[PDB]
Amino acid sequence: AEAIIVAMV
Amino acid sequence: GQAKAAPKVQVYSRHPATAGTENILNCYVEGFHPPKIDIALLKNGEPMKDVKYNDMSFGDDWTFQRLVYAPFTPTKSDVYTCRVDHEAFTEPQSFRWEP
Amino acid sequence: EPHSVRYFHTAVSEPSPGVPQFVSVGYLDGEAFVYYDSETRRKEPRADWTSAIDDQQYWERNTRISQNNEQIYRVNLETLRERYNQSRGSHTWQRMYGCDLLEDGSIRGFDQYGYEGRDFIALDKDTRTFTAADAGAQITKRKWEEEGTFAETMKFYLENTCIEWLRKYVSYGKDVLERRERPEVRVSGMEADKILTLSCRAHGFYPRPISISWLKDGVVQEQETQRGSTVPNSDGTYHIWATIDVLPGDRDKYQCRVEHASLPQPGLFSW
């Protein structure tokens, strides 16, 4: 399953 | 700035080829960047029927891969090629199947 | 018995045929099992064993995550276009992450990001820092670090959640991961300019690892053999070829040695 936390640059 | 990587192309059949027999023709295009690309499987220069495109993938160097494939029955007459157009080429390139 | 789960994210600023704005593919041991792109906007299977997943909310939960990821990467492409002081045009944002479960039970995890096909930033999960490739990436290195949240979170995901799903996946995928399919070999020859070229093709083997060798009387002709890369078939099996240029005289001295898990002993193949 993919990670819930988002990756904002 | 942007990577500009040209693809290399392998053409090959699912099984050892024997004329008159059902087979699947494969074209594997790998090592290109950016992901914009046109891949065509050609029978005697003409477009083939029933081509599929598996999902694009990529690897540790960020370059992309794609498997294009189609069922075919190879014969001693026909010429199957894979035509690949991508901006790292100077012009569309062709890759020949060898039976 | 090692195993890996990996997710691959591709986000572009101008789409083209075959290249949606956003695409996410999940791979189990290098074979695909989940897909999402920005045109259908739903998570969908790519392997039949995903029907064994018992979590009812699995496809809808992962759809929303993917819908988050595409919103955020649209924003990331915009951020990076301004940061690197670039014009509007074709641009590429990419991310790989996942976990490995090694033979002894230990685990590894990764989270790498790439912009325009070059490295950008990557997690060092066991120091909770990021490696930046760039001054542009250092701006991100600083933001994630001064806020001090994200590296700890992804580390938890990689070491924990990711490994719990991998064990579940490995169990569901038992039949497909463990199968062995023998390669079907044919050797071909071609004499051009009093030089005979011998070609070996292994068709349809599984799993992926394979060694293909040309032998002159049982001796490896390593620096004379030209081999192809391992290439996928449409059914999840693989393909590889190796050629050798020889003198037409030495001809029955050559054997192609195929070494693969499906064979109890390496297969020897003559023309």
Side-chain angles (χ1 to χ4, degrees):
Chain A
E2 295 215 35
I4 299 196
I5 197 80
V6 284
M8 195 140 29
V9 140
Chain B
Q2 314 187 350
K4 203 64 65 132
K8 60 193 217 83
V9 185
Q10 269 179 86
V11 189
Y12 57 105
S13 58
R14 168 66 181 79
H15 300 287
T18 86
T21 318
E22 186 68 6
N23 210 328
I24 306 188
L25 172 71
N26 297 318
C27 181
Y28 195 53
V29 189
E30 74 191 301
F32 54 104
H33 208 292
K36 172 172 185 197
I37 203 169
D38 181 79
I39 303 165
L41 281 178
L42 269 26
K43 172 186 196 165
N44 295 312
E46 297 328 296
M48 261 168 102
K49 59 193 314 318
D50 310 321
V51 176
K52 304 280 151 125
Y53 300 76
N54 97 328
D55 315 301
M56 207 169 275
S57 76
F58 64 83
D60 321 276
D61 69 356
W62 306 107
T63 61
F64 289 98
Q65 296 104 45
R66 226 195 218 291
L67 162 66
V68 183
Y69 67 96
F72 85 137
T73 317
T75 66
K76 282 160 216 220
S77 329
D78 299 304
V79 170
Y80 295 95
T81 73
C82 190
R83 188 186 193 270
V84 181
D85 173 36
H86 177 278
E87 52 194 273
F89 289 149
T90 301
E91 41 199 312
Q93 303 285 329
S94 242
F95 299 84
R96 212 222 203 246
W97 183 54
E98 299 291 345
Chain C
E1 53 158 320
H3 299 287
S4 63
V5 150
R6 298 255 204 286
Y7 293 97
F8 295 75
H9 297 176
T10 301
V12 292
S13 67
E14 293 161 9
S16 31
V19 186
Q21 203 278 317
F22 172 72
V23 172
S24 165
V25 197
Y27 290 86
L28 174 75
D29 277 18
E31 198 72 56
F33 69 96
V34 285
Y35 178 100
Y36 169 101
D37 67 36
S38 59
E39 275 163 318
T40 57
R41 310 200 67 253
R42 307 278 332 175
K43 203 89 163 194
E44 39 187 36
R46 286 281 188 279
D48 284 331
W49 62 249
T50 55
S51 61
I53 287 163
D54 71 18
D55 190 344
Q56 280 274 130
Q57 294 293 108
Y58 180 93
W59 303 92
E60 198 263 349
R61 189 175 80 252
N62 285 289
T63 293
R64 301 314 170 187
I65 300 171
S66 283
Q67 288 171 2
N68 279 341
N69 283 333
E70 73 156 288
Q71 225 276 24
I72 288 299
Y73 298 164
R74 256 195 279 112
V75 169
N76 286 336
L77 282 158
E78 202 26 61
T79 295
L80 289 176
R81 198 204 43 101
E82 298 175 77
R83 169 162 324 156
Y84 286 103
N85 188 24
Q86 289 170 356
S87 292
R88 311 216 173 70
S90 253
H91 294 81
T92 303
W93 169 255
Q94 287 167 269
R95 181 193 182 189
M96 328 156 62
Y97 71 85
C99 47
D100 301 320
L101 180 63
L102 312 185
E103 297 83 343
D104 62 75
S106 63
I107 70 187
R108 291 182 293 117
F110 327 83
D111 192 9
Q112 316 167 350
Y113 304 68
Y115 187 52
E116 316 281 57
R118 23 156 182 82
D119 288 354
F120 175 79
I121 210 182
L123 180 64
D124 191 340
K125 100 164 152 71
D126 289 325
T127 73
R128 298 148 205 269
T129 38
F130 299 91
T131 302
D134 228 318
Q138 209 89 18
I139 286 163
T140 297
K141 185 183 162 85
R142 284 183 288 261
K143 161 151 118 201
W144 291 352
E145 258 157 58
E146 289 134 8
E147 287 169 2
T149 319
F150 181 55
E152 217 282 281
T153 320
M154 268 309 299
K155 177 193 211 275
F156 185 84
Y157 166 77
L158 293 167
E159 283 165 6
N160 286 108
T161 316
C162 189
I163 298 287
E164 290 147 19
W165 283 107
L166 179 153
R167 294 184 207 269
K168 292 200 255 201
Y169 292 148
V170 165
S171 153
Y172 303 141
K174 198 188 27 182
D175 295 355
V176 174
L177 266 9
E178 268 158 26
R179 95 200 186 270
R180 294 213 222 79
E181 289 198 59
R182 288 179 14 104
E184 196 193 340
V185 186
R186 158 175 313 161
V187 191
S188 295
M190 220 77 260
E191 266 186 359
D193 281 325
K194 267 312 163 225
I195 277 287
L196 161 84
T197 287
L198 284 189
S199 196
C200 197
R201 283 208 180 251
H203 295 80
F205 56 99
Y206 180 89
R208 205 178 178 263
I210 188 156
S211 150
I212 185 167
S213 271
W214 270 115
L215 301 200
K216 194 200 203 150
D217 254 66
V219 184
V220 213
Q221 307 299 106
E222 214 17 60
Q223 318 88 346
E224 300 127 78
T225 312
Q226 184 201 123
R227 99 167 44 70
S229 52
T230 289
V231 288
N233 287 303
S234 68
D235 56 356
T237 65
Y238 305 89
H239 184 100
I240 202 175
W241 61 266
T243 36
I244 187 144
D245 295 324
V246 307
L247 255 330
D250 303 305
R251 165 205 32 166
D252 280 70
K253 266 237 149 99
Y254 296 101
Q255 286 192 301
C256 173
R257 191 184 46 181
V258 178
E259 203 158 355
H260 176 264
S262 82
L263 306 179
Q265 283 94 230
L268 254 38
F269 297 98
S270 294
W271 189 30

